[PDB]
Design a protein around this nucleic acid. Structure first.
Lengths: 125, 128, 51, 59, 113
RNA sequence: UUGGGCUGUUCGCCCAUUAAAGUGGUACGCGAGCUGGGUUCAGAACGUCGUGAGACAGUUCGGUCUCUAUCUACUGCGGGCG
RNA sequence: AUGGAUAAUAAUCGGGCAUAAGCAUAUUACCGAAGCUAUGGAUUUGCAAGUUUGCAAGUGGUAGGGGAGCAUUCUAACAGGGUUGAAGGUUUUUCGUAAGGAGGGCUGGACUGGUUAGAAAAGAAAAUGUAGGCAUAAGUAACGAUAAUGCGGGCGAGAAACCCGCACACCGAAAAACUAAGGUUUCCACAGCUAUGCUAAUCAGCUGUGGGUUAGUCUGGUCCUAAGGCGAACCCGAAAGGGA
RNA sequence: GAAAAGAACCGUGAAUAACGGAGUGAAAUAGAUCCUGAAACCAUACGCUUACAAGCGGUCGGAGCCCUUUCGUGGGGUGACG
């Protein structure tokens, strides 16, 4: 019974899961679009939305708070320099997820998790 | 009977267009699963099904159908291909010569492992 | 655990070598039996040495 | 436990009736005509079309 | 000299297996299962031949009884009055008449009654 | 239609309660459900018998409980057809 | 006819059910077996005609006893068949009490076989029989320490596992370095993904081609000896041989 | 295979994996797993039946429906039901 457990362990320990979620965010920040599985992308979305939300105000406290999550100054500076300037005043949902088929080794459903404000060719409708 | 006469009479394959895939290192029970989805379908619906099937037994079955289409185009040179409306008349997945290897089980005994093969045959036929 | 065969290419030759078979009177009959049967490999001394 | 009787080719054939495969949900886009999986993107020619638009232009 | 009965060894069992045609499962192709089923089939066929002669007489008697009870009679009384009248018609012909020729059956009944 | 002390115990005696602490069957129900405490494996010792090797309905310490559920029988959930 | 207690999975005239369809006596008709009879056929003894017929009595059968035969392989004589299609394999028709015989269609492409007589490696359904092949359990157990992976580029038809880079994690009196025993080319480079790798692989301790080991001072011999071995001479023992 | 005459060449395919053609032959369903090549075993097409019905799966009766026919109280296949 998991009547309310709104968190995906991703078949990993409590430390490995957070390490992977912090390692994927740096990649999604330095390259504005990465290719993952569907569940990992859906978890990365919920992990990275509040960070980009906090990044909309450059304070010495918010910088350290985001650093405590990202654990890399190279991603902290690249999130606070241009990602925050290009997001602007969006209400929410700074990322999009698009399925691109299945893999070959284990037949896993793939996804193309991307930033909304960095893709100028796709709108949705 | 005269064997040359029997062979000249049986050489009626100048009309039927078919394709064969012999000595494929895959089991027949796993390709008979994807053959049932293709049997009887149109020549393009079958291609789409084989291209988007979530089975490793379709990557080499989707090009056997293309080879069959090319053989049909070779045999019926006078005429296009989309007006005929090809389909998959018959498709059979048979067995093949299997290799035998040994796996050491616990307590000093050996079990047998048979790497199986399979033969695939496909004929197209036309609606016209 | 420790098995029964712990190889040694001198304890092998001191016990099954050609000069150990040829030294005894009844050990010299093993050579005759093997030559009569037609064994391509005689006593373990037939194994090639390291070169 | 161990089977007491060899499974007949009828009892083992009536059991392999739900062992069939499942044909995927294939759709077609009325932009480039290429077929794809429903609710999935696809690469046509150096590009990625999803819903009539272009997501990636790698040409 | 060395004598091997290889051809006739299988030609003998082909003939015994060709009459196990239509049997369920491996009783039609497997030799040691077909031979055990053909012999039992022949054992069943030897009998049921004595029973075909007494299962048809029951049907004839039932049909004669049905045809005789339409005229307010019974099979026992009808057969008694027929046998003690010098008629000598077997139950096969009597049932054929009761089924196909009710006029002839009722004529026989009125003559023996 | 109870919980404990003693015993491997069934049984039995005792302690404190309860309306009551029933008699039996189901391979003395149930080990492809569990434990191996007792009993009949190999070690050792005591009493007794046998000259001896050895034995005891005599006692004591220690001592490997194998198997991926085919059919039927159950507990649940689905597809097809009518 | 009535009362005289009953056993543990749901029960009983076999069941429906019957106030007669229960019980007692008497009568008639009918049903009822491979019993008897009617028809057809086969066979064993005994009696006659002959060279098969007629009559009489029979004809369940284990251990066991007797008599007539079939197929298979080969041989001796006479007489044959076959590339205008032999043996063999697959279907079909017909004949005989049966073992079996003969004919036709299809595959097959070189041997085969009638009559009489003879010989035997002369017939499988079972021996927890032997060898080979193939099923079932079943697409089930399992894929071999719960130290861990994520992303971006490269070759490529094809990348969760290959190469590069940035991150994460593990060992660190070790999962680090040398090397003995042992293995005896597994070492290095390039081509390959057939078999091998418990998955795929563009990768490899795998496959095929070209290379790789340099000593006056290191380890052994040319130097020495222990335990032990051999051992002229010598002492014993049928022989081989033992002691030294 | 009598003799390599052992498949030049073209197409699909990434592919000298496989196949379809084209040439050799009397034969390629004689293609190197190569003479004929059966049985177990694994599949496809066609004809008849099968989702209210309990057991050595057969035997004796018996409609209906498909092929053949010397035309039939002829043959073959499946067979509801007893």
């Amino acid at each position: 019974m998991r009547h309310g457990k709104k968190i995906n362990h991703l078949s990993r320990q409590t430390g490995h899961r957070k390490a992977m979620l912090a390692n994927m965010a740096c990649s999604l920040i330095e390259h504005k679009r990465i290719n993952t599985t569907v569940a990992k992308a859906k978890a990365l979305k919920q992990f990275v939305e509040p960070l980009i939300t906090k990044s909309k105000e450059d304070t010495t406290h918010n910088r350290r708070i985001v650093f405590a999550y990202l654990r890399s100054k190279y991603a902290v500076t690249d999130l606070f320099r241009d990602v925050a300037a290009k997001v602007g005043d969006r209400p929410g949902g700074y990322t999009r997820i698009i399925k691109v088929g299945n893999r070959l080794g284990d037949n896993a459903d793939m996804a193309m998790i991307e930033l909304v404000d960095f893709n100028e060719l796709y709108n949705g409708g | 009977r005269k064997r040359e006469t029997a062979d000249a009479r049986k050489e009626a394959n100048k009309s039927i267009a078919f394709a064969k895939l012999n000595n494929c290192p895959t089991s027949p029970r796993k390709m008979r699963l994807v053959a049932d989805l293709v049997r009887g379908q149109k020549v393009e619906r079958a291609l789409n099904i084989l291209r988007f099937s979530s089975k490793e037994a379709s990557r080499k079955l989707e090009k056997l159908l293309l080879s069959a289409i090319n053989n049909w185009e070779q045999k019926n040179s006078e005429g296009n291909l989309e007006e005929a409306g090809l389909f998959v008349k018959e498709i059979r997945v048979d067995g093949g010569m299997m290799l035998k290897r040994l796996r050491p089980a616990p307590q000093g005994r050996a079990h047998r492992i048979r790497k199986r093969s399979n033969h695939v045959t496909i004929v197209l036929g036309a609606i016209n | 655990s420790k098995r029964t065969f712990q190889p040694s290419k001198r304890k092998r030759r001191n016990k099954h070598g050609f000069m150990d078979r040829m030294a005894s009177a009844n050990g010299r009959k093993v050579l005759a039996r093997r030559r009569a049967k037609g064994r391509h490999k005689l006593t373990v001394s037939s194994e090639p040495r390291h070169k | 436990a161990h089977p007491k009787r060899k499974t007949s080719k009828t009892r083992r054939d009536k059991r392999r009736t739900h062992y069939k495969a499942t044909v995927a949900q294939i759709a077609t886009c009325p932009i480039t005509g290429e077929a794809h999986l429903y609710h999935r993107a696809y690469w046509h020619e150096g590009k990625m079309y999803y819903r009539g638009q272009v997501v990636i232009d790698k040409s | 000299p060395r004598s091997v009965n290889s051809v006739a060894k299988r030609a003998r069992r082909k003939k015994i297996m060709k009459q196990a045609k239509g049997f369920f499962g491996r009783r039609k192709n497997v030799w040691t299962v077909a031979k055990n089923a053909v012999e039992k089939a022949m054992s069943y066929a030897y009998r049921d031949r004595k029973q075909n002669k007494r299962n048809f007489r029951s049907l004839w008697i039932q049909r004669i009884n049905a045809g005789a009870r339409l005229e307010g009679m019974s099979y026992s009384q009808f057969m008694g009055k027929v046998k003690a009248n010098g008629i000598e018609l077997n139950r096969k012909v009597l049932a054929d008449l009761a089924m196909n020729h009710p006029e002839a059956f009722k004529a026989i009944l009125n003559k023996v009654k």
